[PDB]
Ligand binder design. Structure first.
Ligand code: HEM
Ligand SMILES: COc1c2occc2cc2ccc(=O)oc12
Length: 467
């Protein structure tokens, strides 16, 4: 039947709000799924959204009907600053043009090649110095990890890294951490439903907007400088490249290459290339302290394959199935972006005997794919075996979708995977982790779950490995 997926009856404007717990959107949605099935319709305030739970529904839509589900839906807190500009939250021609250019420009600046691998290895060296600098003292690893991660994408988009002592750099990192935290709280999820009123009201969301505003202001300041020092012949970074394409297109009235898309696209990458990787690393170390046996096996593999002298290199991954399994399990357990970024159908679509009118938003519940009990034996526990066969070799999974899938999937996945492996490996090779508390008492449940999955605050010490 040409019918929209089934779902609970919505009330005018508020939608299904009375049937949802904004502090736990994910659980609220999965519960509703228990009654209506894997594919259902929900009304987040006035926003009608088709929810996709489980591997099959998600893959069937985003991959089997990729083009139809390739539209970009909204994320209200982020659209407040982006407003449809830039590569992430853009649609149609704007997105195709910005995405093609971004992927190309990233590769031209080392992504995938030896260039960025070297940059990551150097930055990891700096992270190691910094952790040695704590003298084994108990610390909050949060900004040690974010400063390192950020410098990778920062050297690509800005021309070079930030000094670890640059206070403005810490400030930008605080803004990123804060925005991801806000969109993961109940107020952030309430904003997803009622932004029409809430953006004009006092409250936590206003402080969230200022963080985005500070990030935009910073990007706009970096662009100006690049502009007044640009060598049309020798671009220094992503910004230069984009400024050059802008000049080339100065004659195309319909060009997507203009200042606003440069500021928004660069901001997209600065944030995207920072907080996601940083949050995964942070959750990862907490999971390893909770499971010493896994850290032990990681240490075994690192000592055999890499040893204690040379810097780990990306190709080492081919020889380390356990480590590769652990990183996969960390991303699977962490479920950093539990509901992906909303997609939307480009045109009237037919999906599993259901009807989805053009423009309909879609929520691919990645978290439900990473925990599909039909793909992982103990979906609720942290267990690397989930990514190993009986002979202890690495085993892929069609349900491993932390980067989502399809036409608007994460094109930073390559950089991210290189970062996760090189940082997790280089740190583990140099230190054993010591929990400020007892393994049995470490809580790995998340502190917040909304747009992102935020792990609980913790402290730890990095103890060197020598004797
Ligand atoms: C552990 C790290 C990361 C995770 C879990 C992650 C996750 C995701 C997800 C789930 C999406 C939405 C995909 C979709 O619509 O289907 C996405 C989008 C995107 N990611 Fe990542 N990401 C990570 C790191 C990166 C990095 C390092 C960069 C930057 C180079 C980045 C750049 C982007 C961009 C530009 C998009 C938007 C793509 C588009 O709309 O066409 N991501 N990411
Ligand atoms: C481009 O990278 C990303 C992301 O990647 C994965 C999640 C995610 C969220 C944002 C939000 C704002 C932004 O500017 O960028 C983002």
């Amino acid at each position: 039947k040409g019918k929209l997926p089934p779902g609970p009856t919505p009330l005018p404007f508020i939608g299904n709000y009375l049937q949802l717990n904004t502090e736990q959107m994910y659980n609220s949605l999965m519960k509703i799924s228990e009654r209506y099935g894997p594919v259902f319709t929900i009304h987040l305030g006035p926003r009608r959204v088709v929810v996709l739970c489980g591997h099959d529904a998600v893959r069937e839509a985003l991959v089997d009907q990729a083009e139809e589900f390739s539209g970009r839906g909204e994320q209200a807190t982020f659209d407040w600053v982006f407003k449809g500009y830039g590569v992430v939250f853009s649609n149609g021609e704007r997105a195709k043009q910005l995405r093609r250019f971004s992927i190309a420009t990233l590769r031209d600046f080392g992504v995938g090649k030896r260039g960025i691998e070297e940059r990551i290895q150097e930055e990891a060296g700096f992270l190691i110095d910094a952790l040695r600098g704590t003298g084994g003292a108990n610390i909050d690893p949060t900004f040690f990890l974010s400063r390192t991660v950020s410098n990778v994408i920062s050297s690509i988009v800005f021309g070079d890294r930030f000094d670890y002592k640059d206070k403005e750099f810490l400030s930008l990192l605080r803004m990123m951490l804060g925005i991801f935290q806000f969109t993961s709280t109940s107020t952030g999820q309430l904003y997803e439903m009622f932004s029409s009123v809430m953006k004009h009201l006092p409250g936590p969301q206003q402080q969230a907007f200022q963080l985005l505003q500070g990030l935009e202001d910073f990007i706009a300041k970096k662009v100006e400088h690049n502009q007044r020092t640009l060598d049309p012949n020798s671009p220094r970074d992503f910004i230069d490249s984009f400024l050059i394409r802008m000049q080339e297109e100065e004659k195309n009235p319909n060009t997507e290459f203009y200042l606003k898309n440069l500021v928004m696209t660069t901001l997209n990458l600065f944030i995207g290339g920072t907080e996601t990787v940083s949050t995964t690393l942070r959750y990862g170390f907490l999971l390893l302290m909770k499971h010493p046996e896994v850290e032990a096996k990681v240490h075994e593999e690192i000592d055999r394959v890499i040893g204690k002298n040379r810097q780990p290199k990306f190709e080492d991954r081919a020889k380390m199935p356990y480590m590769e399994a652990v990183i996969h399990e960390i991303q699977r357990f962490g479920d950093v972006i539990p509901m992906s970024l909303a997609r939307r159908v480009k045109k009237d679509t037919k999906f599993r005997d259901f009807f989805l009118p053009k423009g309909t938003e879609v929520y691919p519940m990645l978290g439900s794919v990473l925990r599909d009990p039909s793909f992982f034996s103990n979906p609720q526990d942290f267990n690397p075996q989930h990514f190993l066969n009986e002979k202890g070799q690495f085993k892929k999974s069609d349900a491993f979708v932390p980067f989502s899938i399809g036409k608007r999937n994460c094109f930073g996945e390559g950089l991210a995977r290189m970062e996760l492996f090189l940082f997790f490996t280089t740190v583990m090779q140099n230190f054993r982790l010591k929990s400020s508390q007892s393994p049995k008492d470490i809580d790995v449940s998340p502190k917040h779950v909304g747009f992102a999955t935020i792990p609980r605050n913790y402290t730890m010490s990095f103890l060197p490995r020598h004797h």
